Design a protein around this ligand. Structure first.
Ligand SMILES: *[C@@](O)(c1nc2c(F)cccc2s1)[C@H](C[C@@H]1CCNC1=O)NC(=O)[C@@H]1[C@@H]2[C@H](CN1C(=O)[C@@H](NC(=O)C(F)(F)F)C(C)(C)C)C2(C)C
Ligand SMILES: *[C@@](O)(c1nc2c(F)cccc2s1)[C@H](C[C@@H]1CCNC1=O)NC(=O)[C@@H]1[C@@H]2[C@H](CN1C(=O)[C@@H](NC(=O)C(F)(F)F)C(C)(C)C)C2(C)C
Lengths: 303, 303
């Protein structure tokens, strides 16, 4: 039936890795994997250091014992520290016994991941996000959420892809991979920064239309087809990402399952962009959803 | 900022309780708490028994050894079985060492909970749901999801409120509390059953409008107020639940935080119902959201 939900990965393998990192009066979250704790390097900042911190200079004045690391109620001993890009790596004398099989991945714009929102090292909530084309995410983060991570789970392996650092003025979020490199052009200082144009992830909207068809929501199917070049003219007007032949190939499984050629679905999407949804819903949404990948759709449609 | 997401509870405390229950050729999920496994009683049904099962008669032919219970790759020994309403309770010789502090609660229509969707005893995904006024939920469930549970977490205590049993023809879902009593008038047989009218949870839409204001999405605030009786005339036309003085009292914290009297917000809601959203969004939604309780809003707005 028409039941289709934004589903997050079960969070238990990540919950066991969240710790609290305190330096002076600043507390945020860290990720404890093996004998290393990862956290945003601005744990070392006071509120008169945020406008333009010199992180190398601020770190000169910090020693192992200035980093307080707490896993639940239990204190970790810090035996080494280093800065890698915008993350701090705290070497502790105890390997996390709850460390899962894991990898660090730098995800591509358009890919989705689960966020485990944490405050003071304690898990608060889990939700699904996408890396947007402008390298922001539409999260739900407050003061104290920094160091919360984004991940995907493939069988038993956790692929960590995001660490939370900041909120931009449109209310969207920016952060790093687990090597401390920002997604997008953002820097970890409190200066005027703005997200570029928020373009729609075309291949995901198409995947979600396939999901609607598989789930029996079929009203938007029309009698038309189109070409990649003509569809892509329409993509540009409505700030959709161009569709490529790689995107068409990636939609192959969904196309094969439904028997609907990708260019036929593109012609259905073209009409939805030009005419709107006339106050109808698709899988219970009144807007075109772009935060389900082709892989997410196949997963939620086939178990 | 305007970031507000359907957030689920972290699932780790529930993941450790999911097992697989097999009886003959039927496999579904069970919940392993202390030395008891809970699962839907139709684990004992074959596909020629679903139209009108006599569960008491079907259970006569079942012994402890006919219930296969697997936690991961590890077989549990069944030393007793009983039927309680629409659930089976399998006594096993091993207390689940991962059993969390927990309670069984029968939730009220309008209350929200997290679902951990499971297939073959393995967690697949987590998402937030509401018990709708017609005692259905708008889930994402396939074949094999039966026995998946709904829960809330308050600190360290897990309150189990839902076990999944069935899908109705509108694509919505029905199930039981953990004592095996259905929410609503549904029965565990494959017969013509239909959800009643799907009314909107008025107090939740109001809570979500307070969230929009707290998050700076303010365009829908107007210069008007109304009365409970006049608002409630409008509630009826649009299939909204009547608003009561208890609902007004429950919205007290959000009213106090924003300084917006509940009847002023009701007058804003009245105009949104009568005039629609004119293709605008509130917290990124093109429809009025009713699956955030006042408590959910306060939680996501205050950490
Ligand atoms: C995060 O939790 C952190 N909080 C602190 C802190 F209190 C002291 C020292 C270091 C850190 S990191 C927090 C999460 C934000 C808060 C609101 N919603 C969030 O997601 N991150 C920040 O406060 C972050 C840190 C400085 C300023 N930050 C911002 O997010 C600001 N944004 C920007 O300046 C902009 F993005 F450029 F617009 C802010 C506070 C939202 C205006 C730094 C970037 C180091
Ligand atoms: C659930 O996973 C179960 N599957 C089996 C099974 F394969 C064999 C024996 C027992 C069970 S319980 C499954 C979940 C459903 C499937 C589709 N989406 C879901 O959420 N539940 C059922 O198949 C359920 C069991 C019989 C028929 N069921 C229904 O959900 C049917 N619905 C109804 O008859 C209606 F609700 F009344 F409309 C169905 C299959 C969707 C048409 C019973 C109620 C015992």
């Amino acid at each position: 039936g028409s039941g289709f939900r934004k589903m997050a990965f079960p969070s238990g393998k990540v919950e066991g890795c969240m710790v609290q990192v305190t330096c002076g009066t600043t507390t945020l979250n860290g990720l404890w994997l093996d004998d290393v704790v990862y956290c945003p390097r601005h744990v070392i900042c006071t509120s008169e250091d945020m406008l333009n911190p010199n992180y190398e200079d601020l770190l000169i004045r910090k020693s192992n014992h200035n980093f307080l690391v707490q896993a639940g109620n239990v204190q970790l001993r810090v035996i080494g520290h280093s800065m890698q890009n915008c993350v701090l790596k705290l070497k502790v004398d105890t390997a996390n016994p709850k460390t899962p099989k894991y990898k660090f991945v730098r995800i591509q714009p358009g890919q989705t991941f689960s966020v485990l929102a944490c405050y003071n090292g304690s898990p608060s909530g889990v939700y699904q996000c996408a890396m947007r084309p402008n390298f922001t995410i539409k999260g739900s983060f407050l003061n104290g959420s920094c160091g919360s991570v984004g991940f995907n789970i493939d069988y038993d392996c956790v692929s960590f892809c995001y660490m939370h650092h900041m909120e931009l003025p449109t209310g969207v979020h920016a952060g790093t991979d687990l090597e401390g490199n920002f997604y997008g052009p953002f820097v970890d200082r409190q200066t005027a920064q703005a997200a570029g144009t928020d373009t729609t992830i075309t291949v995901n909207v198409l995947a979600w239309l396939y999901a609607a068809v598989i789930n029996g929501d079929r009203w938007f199917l029309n009698r038309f087809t189109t070409t990649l070049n003509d569809f892509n003219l329409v993509a540009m007007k409505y700030n959709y990402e161009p569709l490529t032949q790689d995107h068409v190939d990636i939609l192959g499984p969904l196309s094969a399952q439904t028997g609907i050629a990708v260019l036929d679905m593109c012609a259905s999407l073209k009409e939805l962009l030009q005419n709107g949804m006339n106050g109808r819903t698709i899988l219970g949404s009144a807007l075109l959803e772009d935060e389900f990948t082709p892989f997410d759709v196949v997963r939620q449609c086939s178990g």
